[PDB]
């Protein structure tokens, strides 16, 4: 009469089993057990969803899983209660729902447990206060699944006819491609402009070197556009008398960043470790299922009281009181953090070197976010030379604070000077510059852009960036995105005939609509109806000849 606990993977099963007694029987479902299949009637059969019959679905047990279903059913017959312990996101809720639907029995037989990490305490708490399956969240997940299916299965065939066979369309994927295509065109159309900078090397009364940058001339910003103007300025600067107009000394500080969320982990791992978003998320999942970090799909910077107490104790013992803020730093269901601050990257079991590196990144970010700010003594010198104004900036680290937990180190240290001091000109160095086009997207900046526009979600950031590449619309080279010709071809056609679908605001709004379903503020089938109404309006027109406003063929 034990209890049956179901999780999605053998890795999760092994970890969670360490924290569940003999009264519990833990079993993996070996992944998703049931899902959508992988003229109009044939279309509906392929999609597994019927937009014309109120979204009736035809789910099918995944290949090779009938055996898993049988195994779970037999285990269920011997259990007094069943605990669905899938991951906490909407996808996890839907997996739990599918499990309940295939196993059967009364709903009172099931409970849905939620935890942000697999630890003795988190599991104990999750099973002490078990919840119920949330159908609104399930409906939100399926609405997303159905919209995505409709776009992929109904737009793609149009692309095969009009542009080229094999092309794949995606609801959000196409919008992400649009971002890259626009950037490509901005760069192609950019016309650089020439401008010069002039630096002066001087010496203080004590003879110390002081480098200055010319900032103004006649009280206006200094920015010569050619050699002639630069040389004329250099001529005046060579003859000028230099003196310190003002010396400003003020204490400044640098605060540590918030603990990671999915988006920021992807950005940091890419920029700091050179890890692609796919690699980062795969390793993060392994760390999470092994019980080393909190759940890797989150947009919350919240930290539990226990987690904060844990890390503050670590800081106090290992760095000292000067590194401990009076009260915890609050940044805000939880950020991505170590499950146990006392577990070092070097101690991780069955984790590859790069996975240890990711853990270390997460660990240092978490520890640093609860440490005190770094303190600097900043100095800005303003120098006058005839009608010119020059500046020099520097700073001295006074207290490392949170930077102590980061790798050992560079900031400029200006010499001691007093307002009114004369400076001796040693050298002048003009430098030609050119304005630059918008920077290309990097994996880090693309994720950031998706987040900024409200198009990406923790569960989709990685998938979006990966798909747009495999589908041949964009490519990454030298760590930067480049739009492919086909990317531009498809994007133009989609913008022309599927304006609403391609619109950034509408796409962000759809994410909001799904959240509304999840929070019982909207009904899933009605949301799908509205989506489909607007969609079919775009599709019907697009299928027509170009002369009638239909999609332009890929020719000439």
Coordinates of C-alpha atoms in Angstrom, one line a residue:
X1 CA 0.0 0.0 0.0
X2 CA 3.0 2.3 -0.5
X3 CA 2.8 5.5 -2.5
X4 CA 3.8 5.8 -6.1
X5 CA 5.9 8.8 -7.1
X6 CA 6.4 9.5 -10.8
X7 CA 9.2 11.7 -12.3
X8 CA 10.2 12.2 -16.0
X9 CA 13.8 10.9 -15.9
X10 CA 16.0 8.2 -14.3
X11 CA 18.4 10.9 -13.1
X12 CA 15.6 12.7 -11.3
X13 CA 14.3 9.3 -9.9
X14 CA 17.7 8.5 -8.5
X15 CA 18.1 11.8 -6.8
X16 CA 14.6 12.1 -5.4
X17 CA 14.7 8.5 -4.1
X18 CA 17.5 9.6 -1.7
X19 CA 15.0 11.8 0.1
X20 CA 11.8 9.6 0.1
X21 CA 11.3 6.7 2.6
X22 CA 10.3 3.1 2.1
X23 CA 6.6 4.1 2.0
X24 CA 7.4 5.6 -1.4
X25 CA 8.0 3.8 -4.7
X26 CA 9.7 6.1 -7.2
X27 CA 9.4 5.4 -10.9
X28 CA 10.5 7.3 -14.0
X29 CA 8.2 7.7 -17.0
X30 CA 11.2 7.6 -19.3
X31 CA 10.2 11.0 -20.7
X32 CA 6.9 12.2 -22.1
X33 CA 4.5 9.3 -22.2
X34 CA 1.8 10.8 -24.4
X35 CA 1.7 13.8 -26.8
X36 CA 0.6 15.1 -30.2
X37 CA 1.7 13.0 -33.2
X38 CA 5.2 13.5 -34.4
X39 CA -7.3 17.9 -47.6
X40 CA -8.5 19.3 -44.2
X41 CA -9.1 15.8 -42.7
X42 CA -5.5 14.7 -43.5
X43 CA -4.3 18.0 -42.1
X44 CA -6.1 17.5 -38.8
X45 CA -4.8 13.9 -38.6
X46 CA -1.3 15.1 -39.1
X47 CA -1.6 17.9 -36.5
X48 CA -3.5 15.9 -34.0
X49 CA -5.6 19.0 -33.3
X50 CA -8.8 20.2 -34.9
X51 CA -9.2 24.0 -35.1
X52 CA -12.6 23.5 -36.8
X53 CA -14.0 21.1 -34.2
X54 CA -13.3 23.2 -31.0
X55 CA -9.7 22.0 -30.7
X56 CA -10.5 18.4 -30.2
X57 CA -7.1 16.6 -29.8
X58 CA -5.8 13.2 -30.7
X59 CA -3.0 12.4 -28.3
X60 CA -0.9 9.3 -28.8
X61 CA 1.4 7.3 -26.5
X62 CA 5.0 7.9 -27.7
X63 CA 6.8 5.2 -29.5
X64 CA 8.1 2.5 -27.2
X65 CA 6.2 3.8 -24.2
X66 CA 3.2 1.4 -24.1
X67 CA 5.4 -0.8 -22.0
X68 CA 6.0 2.2 -19.6
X69 CA 2.2 2.7 -19.4
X70 CA 1.7 -0.9 -18.5
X71 CA 4.4 -0.8 -15.9
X72 CA 2.9 2.4 -14.3
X73 CA -0.6 1.0 -14.3
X74 CA 0.5 -2.1 -12.4
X75 CA 2.4 0.0 -9.9
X76 CA -0.6 2.2 -9.5
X77 CA -2.9 -0.7 -8.7
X78 CA -0.7 -1.5 -5.7
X79 CA -0.4 2.2 -4.5
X80 CA -2.8 3.9 -2.2
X81 CA -1.9 7.3 -3.6
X82 CA 0.0 8.6 -6.6
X83 CA 2.3 11.7 -6.5
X84 CA 3.0 13.4 -9.8
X85 CA 6.5 14.9 -9.2
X86 CA 7.2 16.4 -12.6
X87 CA 9.2 19.7 -13.0
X88 CA 7.3 22.8 -11.8
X89 CA 6.8 24.6 -15.2
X90 CA 3.7 24.4 -17.4
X91 CA 5.2 21.7 -19.6
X92 CA 5.7 19.7 -16.3
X93 CA 2.1 20.3 -15.4
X94 CA 1.0 18.9 -18.8
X95 CA 3.2 15.9 -18.5
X96 CA 1.6 15.2 -15.1
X97 CA -1.8 15.6 -16.7
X98 CA -1.0 13.1 -19.5
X99 CA 0.3 10.7 -16.8
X100 CA -3.0 10.9 -14.9
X101 CA -5.0 10.5 -18.1
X102 CA -3.2 7.4 -19.2
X103 CA -3.0 5.7 -15.8
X104 CA -6.6 6.5 -14.9
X105 CA -8.6 6.0 -11.7
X106 CA -10.3 8.7 -9.7
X107 CA -8.7 12.1 -9.6
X108 CA -8.6 11.9 -5.8
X109 CA -5.9 9.3 -6.3
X110 CA -3.5 11.9 -7.5
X111 CA -1.5 14.8 -6.0
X112 CA 0.9 17.2 -7.9
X113 CA 4.0 18.0 -5.9
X114 CA 6.2 21.1 -6.6
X115 CA 9.8 21.8 -5.7
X116 CA 12.5 24.2 -6.8
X117 CA 15.3 21.8 -6.0
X118 CA 15.8 18.1 -5.1
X119 CA 17.1 18.2 -1.5
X120 CA 16.1 16.5 1.7
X121 CA 14.3 19.6 3.0
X122 CA 12.7 20.7 -0.3
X123 CA 11.3 17.2 -1.0
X124 CA 10.1 16.8 2.6
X125 CA 8.2 20.1 2.3
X126 CA 6.9 19.3 -1.1
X127 CA 5.4 16.0 0.0
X128 CA 4.2 17.4 3.4
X129 CA 2.0 19.9 1.6
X130 CA 1.1 18.2 -1.7
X131 CA -1.0 20.2 -4.2
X132 CA -3.5 19.4 -6.9
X133 CA -3.1 19.3 -10.7
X134 CA -3.7 22.8 -12.0
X135 CA -5.8 22.5 -15.2
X136 CA -5.5 26.2 -16.0
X137 CA -1.7 25.7 -16.3
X138 CA -2.2 22.5 -18.4
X139 CA -4.6 24.5 -20.7
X140 CA -2.0 27.2 -21.0
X141 CA 0.6 24.7 -22.1
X142 CA -1.7 23.0 -24.6
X143 CA -2.9 26.4 -26.0
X144 CA 0.8 27.1 -26.7
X145 CA 1.3 23.7 -28.2
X146 CA -1.7 24.0 -30.4
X147 CA -0.9 27.5 -31.7
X148 CA 2.7 26.4 -32.5
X149 CA 1.4 23.3 -34.3
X150 CA -1.1 25.3 -36.4
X151 CA 1.6 27.8 -37.5
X152 CA 4.2 25.1 -38.3
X153 CA 1.8 22.7 -40.1
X154 CA -0.2 25.3 -42.0
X155 CA 2.3 28.0 -42.9
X156 CA 5.1 25.6 -43.9
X157 CA 3.2 24.0 -46.8
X158 CA 2.6 27.5 -48.1
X159 CA 6.3 28.1 -48.0
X160 CA 6.9 24.9 -49.9
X161 CA 4.7 26.0 -52.7
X162 CA 5.7 29.6 -52.9
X163 CA 9.4 29.6 -51.8
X164 CA 11.1 26.2 -51.5
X165 CA 10.4 22.6 -50.3
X166 CA 11.6 21.7 -46.8
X167 CA 11.2 25.1 -45.2
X168 CA 9.9 25.3 -41.7
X169 CA 7.8 28.1 -40.2
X170 CA 7.5 28.7 -36.4
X171 CA 5.3 31.0 -34.5
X172 CA 8.1 32.6 -32.4
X173 CA 10.9 31.3 -34.5
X174 CA 9.9 33.4 -37.5
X175 CA 9.9 36.5 -35.3
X176 CA 13.3 35.8 -33.9
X177 CA 14.6 35.5 -37.4
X178 CA 13.1 38.8 -38.2
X179 CA 15.2 40.4 -35.4
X180 CA 18.4 39.1 -37.0
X181 CA 17.3 40.1 -40.6
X182 CA 16.6 43.6 -39.5
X183 CA 20.0 43.9 -37.9
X184 CA 21.6 42.6 -41.0
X185 CA 19.9 45.2 -43.1
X186 CA 20.8 48.0 -40.7
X187 CA 24.4 47.0 -40.9
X188 CA 24.4 46.8 -44.7
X189 CA 22.9 50.3 -45.1
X190 CA 25.2 51.9 -42.5
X191 CA 27.4 54.7 -43.8
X192 CA 30.4 55.3 -41.5
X193 CA 31.5 58.8 -40.7
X194 CA 35.1 60.0 -40.0
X195 CA 36.0 61.8 -36.7
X196 CA 39.2 62.3 -34.7
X197 CA 40.3 62.3 -31.1
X198 CA 43.3 64.1 -29.6
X199 CA 45.1 62.9 -26.5
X200 CA 47.7 64.9 -24.6
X201 CA 50.5 63.5 -22.6
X202 CA 51.6 65.9 -19.8
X203 CA 53.6 66.0 -16.6
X204 CA 52.5 67.3 -13.2
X205 CA 54.6 69.7 -11.1
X206 CA 56.1 66.6 -9.5
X207 CA 57.0 65.2 -12.9
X208 CA 54.5 62.4 -13.0
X209 CA 52.8 61.4 -16.2
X210 CA 49.2 62.5 -16.8
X211 CA 47.3 61.4 -19.9
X212 CA 44.4 63.7 -21.1
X213 CA 41.7 63.5 -23.7
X214 CA 40.5 66.7 -25.4
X215 CA 36.8 67.1 -24.8
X216 CA 35.9 70.6 -25.7
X217 CA 37.0 73.6 -27.8
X218 CA 35.3 77.0 -27.3
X219 CA 33.0 75.4 -24.8
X220 CA 31.6 73.0 -27.5
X221 CA 32.2 69.2 -27.9
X222 CA 35.6 68.6 -29.6
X223 CA 35.1 66.4 -32.7
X224 CA 37.1 67.2 -35.8
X225 CA 35.9 65.3 -39.0
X226 CA 39.1 65.4 -41.0
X227 CA 42.9 65.7 -40.9
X228 CA 42.9 69.5 -41.6
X229 CA 40.6 70.3 -38.6
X230 CA 42.6 68.0 -36.4
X231 CA 46.0 69.5 -37.4
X232 CA 44.7 73.0 -36.8
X233 CA 43.6 72.0 -33.3
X234 CA 46.9 70.2 -32.7
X235 CA 48.7 73.4 -33.7
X236 CA 46.8 75.4 -31.0
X237 CA 47.2 72.7 -28.4
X238 CA 51.0 72.5 -29.0
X239 CA 51.3 76.2 -28.0
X240 CA 48.7 76.3 -25.1
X241 CA 49.4 76.6 -21.4
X242 CA 47.9 73.7 -19.4
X243 CA 46.4 74.0 -15.9
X244 CA 44.1 72.0 -13.7
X245 CA 40.7 73.7 -13.7
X246 CA 39.1 71.2 -11.3
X247 CA 39.9 68.0 -9.4
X248 CA 36.9 66.0 -8.2
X249 CA 37.5 63.2 -5.7
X250 CA 34.4 61.2 -4.7
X251 CA 33.8 57.7 -3.4
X252 CA 32.0 55.4 -5.8
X253 CA 30.8 51.8 -5.5
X254 CA 30.1 48.8 -7.6
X255 CA 27.2 46.4 -6.7
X256 CA 27.1 42.7 -7.4
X257 CA 24.6 41.5 -9.9
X258 CA 21.3 39.7 -9.0
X259 CA 21.4 35.9 -8.8
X260 CA 20.8 34.3 -12.2
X261 CA 17.5 33.6 -14.0
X262 CA 17.4 31.6 -17.2
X263 CA 18.0 34.5 -19.5
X264 CA 21.0 36.0 -17.5
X265 CA 22.6 32.6 -17.0
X266 CA 22.6 32.0 -20.7
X267 CA 24.1 35.5 -21.3
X268 CA 26.8 35.1 -18.6
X269 CA 27.7 31.6 -19.5
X270 CA 28.1 32.6 -23.2
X271 CA 30.1 35.8 -22.6
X272 CA 32.2 34.6 -19.6
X273 CA 32.7 30.9 -20.5
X274 CA 32.0 30.7 -24.2
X275 CA 29.1 28.3 -23.8
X276 CA 26.3 28.2 -26.3
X277 CA 22.7 28.5 -25.0
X278 CA 22.0 24.8 -25.8
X279 CA 25.0 23.6 -23.9
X280 CA 24.3 25.8 -21.0
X281 CA 20.7 24.6 -20.6
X282 CA 21.7 20.9 -21.1
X283 CA 24.3 21.2 -18.3
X284 CA 22.0 23.2 -16.1
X285 CA 19.4 20.5 -16.4
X286 CA 21.9 17.8 -15.4
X287 CA 23.0 19.9 -12.4
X288 CA 19.4 20.4 -11.4
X289 CA 18.4 16.7 -11.7
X290 CA 21.5 15.7 -9.7
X291 CA 20.3 18.0 -6.9
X292 CA 23.1 20.6 -7.2
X293 CA 21.2 23.7 -8.2
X294 CA 17.6 25.0 -8.2
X295 CA 15.3 24.6 -11.2
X296 CA 16.9 26.1 -14.4
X297 CA 13.7 27.5 -15.9
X298 CA 12.9 30.7 -14.0
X299 CA 12.4 34.5 -14.4
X300 CA 12.4 35.2 -10.7
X301 CA 15.4 36.6 -8.8
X302 CA 13.8 35.7 -5.5
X303 CA 15.9 33.8 -2.9
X304 CA 14.3 31.8 0.0
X305 CA 15.0 32.8 3.6
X306 CA 16.9 29.6 4.2
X307 CA 19.0 30.1 1.0
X308 CA 19.9 33.6 2.2
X309 CA 20.7 32.4 5.7
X310 CA 22.9 29.7 4.2
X311 CA 25.0 32.0 2.0
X312 CA 25.3 34.8 4.7
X313 CA 26.8 32.2 7.0
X314 CA 29.2 31.2 4.3
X315 CA 30.3 34.8 3.7
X316 CA 30.7 35.5 7.4
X317 CA 32.9 32.4 8.0
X318 CA 34.9 32.5 4.8
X319 CA 35.3 36.2 4.0
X320 CA 34.4 38.1 7.2
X321 CA 32.0 40.7 8.6
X322 CA 33.1 43.5 6.2
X323 CA 31.7 41.4 3.3
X324 CA 28.4 40.9 5.0
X325 CA 25.7 43.5 4.5
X326 CA 23.6 44.6 7.5
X327 CA 20.6 43.0 6.0
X328 CA 20.1 40.5 3.1
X329 CA 20.0 42.0 -0.4
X330 CA 16.6 41.5 -2.0
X331 CA 16.4 41.4 -5.8
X332 CA 12.9 40.1 -6.4
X333 CA 9.6 31.1 -7.8
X334 CA 13.4 31.2 -7.1
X335 CA 16.6 32.3 -8.9
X336 CA 19.1 29.8 -10.2
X337 CA 21.5 29.0 -7.3
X338 CA 23.4 26.2 -5.6
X339 CA 21.2 24.0 -3.5
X340 CA 24.0 23.8 -1.0
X341 CA 26.5 26.7 -0.7
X342 CA 28.9 24.4 1.0
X343 CA 29.2 22.2 -2.1
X344 CA 32.1 23.4 -4.3
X345 CA 32.3 23.0 -8.1
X346 CA 35.4 20.8 -7.5
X347 CA 33.4 18.3 -5.4
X348 CA 30.6 17.6 -7.9
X349 CA 30.1 13.9 -8.8
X350 CA 29.6 12.7 -12.3
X351 CA 29.7 16.2 -13.8
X352 CA 32.0 17.0 -16.7
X353 CA 34.5 19.8 -16.4
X354 CA 32.3 22.3 -18.2
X355 CA 29.3 21.4 -16.0
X356 CA 31.5 22.1 -13.0
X357 CA 32.5 25.4 -14.6
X358 CA 28.8 26.3 -15.0
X359 CA 28.1 25.4 -11.4
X360 CA 31.0 27.6 -10.4
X361 CA 29.6 30.5 -12.4
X362 CA 26.2 30.0 -10.7
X363 CA 27.9 29.6 -7.3
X364 CA 30.0 32.8 -7.5
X365 CA 27.0 34.8 -8.7
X366 CA 24.9 33.6 -5.8
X367 CA 27.6 34.3 -3.2
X368 CA 28.5 37.7 -4.6
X369 CA 24.9 38.8 -4.7
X370 CA 24.7 38.7 -0.9
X371 CA 28.1 40.4 -0.4
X372 CA 28.8 44.1 0.2
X373 CA 29.5 46.6 -2.6
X374 CA 33.1 47.3 -3.8
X375 CA 34.3 50.7 -2.8
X376 CA 36.4 53.0 -5.0
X377 CA 37.9 56.5 -4.7
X378 CA 37.2 58.0 -8.1
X379 CA 38.9 61.1 -9.5
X380 CA 38.1 63.3 -12.5
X381 CA 40.5 66.0 -13.6
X382 CA 39.4 68.8 -15.8
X383 CA 42.2 70.6 -17.5
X384 CA 42.2 73.9 -19.4
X385 CA 44.5 74.7 -22.3
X386 CA 43.7 78.0 -24.0
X387 CA 40.2 77.6 -25.5
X388 CA 40.3 73.8 -25.0
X389 CA 39.1 71.6 -22.2
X390 CA 40.6 68.1 -21.5
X391 CA 39.7 65.3 -19.0
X392 CA 41.3 62.4 -17.2
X393 CA 39.4 59.8 -15.1
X394 CA 40.8 57.3 -12.7
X395 CA 39.9 55.3 -9.6
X396 CA 41.5 53.5 -6.7
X397 CA 40.0 50.3 -5.2
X398 CA 39.5 50.8 -1.5
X399 CA 37.5 47.7 -0.6
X400 CA 36.9 44.7 -2.9
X401 CA 33.6 43.7 -1.4
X402 CA 31.7 41.2 -3.7
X403 CA 34.6 41.1 -6.2
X404 CA 36.6 39.1 -3.6
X405 CA 34.7 35.9 -4.6
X406 CA 35.6 36.5 -8.3
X407 CA 38.9 35.6 -9.9
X408 CA 41.8 37.9 -8.9
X409 CA 42.4 40.8 -11.3
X410 CA 43.6 47.4 -13.8
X411 CA 41.8 50.7 -13.3
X412 CA 43.7 53.9 -14.1
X413 CA 45.5 55.6 -11.2
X414 CA 45.8 59.4 -11.8
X415 CA 48.8 61.2 -10.2
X416 CA 48.3 63.6 -7.4
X417 CA 47.5 67.1 -8.6
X418 CA 45.8 70.2 -7.2
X419 CA 43.4 72.7 -8.8
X420 CA 45.5 75.4 -10.3
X421 CA 48.5 73.3 -10.9
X422 CA 50.4 73.9 -14.2
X423 CA 51.0 70.9 -16.5
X424 CA 53.8 70.6 -19.0
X425 CA 52.9 69.3 -22.5
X426 CA 55.1 66.3 -23.5
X427 CA 53.2 65.0 -26.5
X428 CA 50.0 65.2 -28.6
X429 CA 48.5 62.2 -30.3
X430 CA 45.7 62.5 -32.8
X431 CA 43.7 59.4 -33.7
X432 CA 41.4 58.8 -36.6
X433 CA 38.1 57.0 -35.8
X434 CA 35.0 55.9 -37.7
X435 CA 31.4 55.6 -36.5
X436 CA 30.3 52.0 -36.4
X437 CA 27.1 50.2 -37.4
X438 CA 24.8 48.5 -34.9
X439 CA 26.6 45.6 -33.3
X440 CA 25.7 42.2 -34.6
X441 CA 23.7 39.9 -32.3
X442 CA 25.7 37.5 -30.2
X443 CA 24.0 34.5 -28.6
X444 CA 24.0 36.5 -25.4
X445 CA 22.6 39.7 -26.9
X446 CA 19.9 37.8 -28.8
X447 CA 18.6 36.2 -25.7
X448 CA 18.6 39.6 -24.0
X449 CA 16.7 41.0 -27.0
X450 CA 14.1 38.2 -26.8
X451 CA 13.6 38.9 -23.1
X452 CA 13.5 42.7 -23.6
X453 CA 10.8 42.4 -26.2
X454 CA 8.8 39.9 -24.1
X455 CA 8.9 37.3 -26.9
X456 CA 11.0 34.7 -25.2
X457 CA 10.2 32.7 -22.1
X458 CA 12.5 30.6 -19.8
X459 CA 11.2 27.4 -21.4
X460 CA 11.7 28.7 -24.9
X461 CA 14.9 30.9 -25.0
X462 CA 17.2 28.1 -25.9
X463 CA 14.9 26.3 -28.3
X464 CA 14.3 29.5 -30.2
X465 CA 18.0 30.3 -30.7
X466 CA 18.7 26.7 -31.7
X467 CA 15.9 26.2 -34.2
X468 CA 16.4 29.4 -36.2
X469 CA 20.0 28.1 -36.9
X470 CA 19.2 24.5 -37.8
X471 CA 16.4 25.7 -40.2
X472 CA 18.9 27.7 -42.2
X473 CA 17.6 31.2 -41.7
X474 CA 20.6 32.5 -39.7
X475 CA 24.1 31.3 -38.9
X476 CA 26.6 32.0 -36.2
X477 CA 30.2 32.7 -37.2
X478 CA 32.9 34.2 -35.0
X479 CA 30.3 34.3 -32.2
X480 CA 28.0 36.6 -34.0
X481 CA 24.7 36.1 -35.9
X482 CA 24.4 36.6 -39.7
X483 CA 21.2 36.4 -41.6
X484 CA 21.1 34.0 -44.5
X485 CA 19.6 34.9 -47.8
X486 CA 16.7 32.5 -47.3
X487 CA 16.2 34.1 -43.9
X488 CA 15.6 37.4 -45.6
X489 CA 13.5 35.8 -48.4
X490 CA 11.1 34.1 -45.9
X491 CA 11.1 37.1 -43.5
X492 CA 10.0 39.5 -46.3
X493 CA 7.2 37.2 -47.4
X494 CA 6.0 36.6 -43.8
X495 CA 6.1 40.3 -43.0
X496 CA 4.0 41.0 -46.2
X497 CA 1.3 38.4 -45.7
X498 CA 1.4 37.5 -42.0
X499 CA 1.9 41.0 -40.5
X500 CA 0.2 40.3 -37.3
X501 CA 2.0 37.0 -36.7
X502 CA 5.3 38.8 -37.4
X503 CA 4.6 41.8 -35.2
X504 CA 6.8 42.1 -32.1
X505 CA 4.1 43.6 -29.9
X506 CA 1.4 41.1 -30.9
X507 CA 3.9 38.2 -30.3
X508 CA 4.6 39.5 -26.8
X509 CA 0.8 40.0 -26.3
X510 CA 0.3 36.3 -27.1
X511 CA 2.7 35.3 -24.3
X512 CA 0.5 37.5 -22.1
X513 CA -2.6 35.7 -23.3
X514 CA -1.1 32.4 -22.3
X515 CA -0.3 33.7 -18.9
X516 CA -3.9 34.9 -18.6
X517 CA -5.1 31.3 -19.4
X518 CA -2.7 30.0 -16.7
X519 CA -4.1 32.4 -14.2
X520 CA -7.8 31.8 -15.0
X521 CA -8.1 35.2 -16.6
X522 CA -8.9 33.8 -20.0
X523 CA -10.2 30.5 -21.4
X524 CA -7.9 28.5 -23.6
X525 CA -10.2 27.5 -26.4
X526 CA -11.5 31.1 -26.8
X527 CA -7.8 32.3 -26.9
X528 CA -7.1 29.7 -29.6
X529 CA -10.3 30.7 -31.5
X530 CA -9.1 34.4 -31.6
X531 CA -5.7 33.3 -32.7
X532 CA -7.0 31.0 -35.4
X533 CA -9.5 33.6 -36.7
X534 CA -6.7 36.2 -37.2
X535 CA -4.4 33.4 -38.5
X536 CA -6.7 32.0 -41.1
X537 CA -7.5 35.6 -42.3
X538 CA -3.7 36.0 -43.0
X539 CA -3.3 32.5 -44.5
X540 CA -6.4 32.6 -46.8
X541 CA -5.1 35.8 -48.4
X542 CA -1.5 34.6 -48.6
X543 CA -2.5 31.5 -50.6
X544 CA -3.8 33.7 -53.4
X545 CA -2.0 34.9 -56.5
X546 CA 0.4 37.9 -55.8
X547 CA -1.8 40.0 -58.2
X548 CA -4.6 39.6 -55.6
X549 CA -2.3 40.4 -52.6
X550 CA -1.1 36.8 -52.1
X551 CA 2.4 35.8 -51.2
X552 CA 5.1 36.6 -53.8
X553 CA 6.8 33.5 -55.3
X554 CA 10.6 33.1 -54.8
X555 CA 11.6 34.0 -58.3
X556 CA 13.5 36.7 -60.3

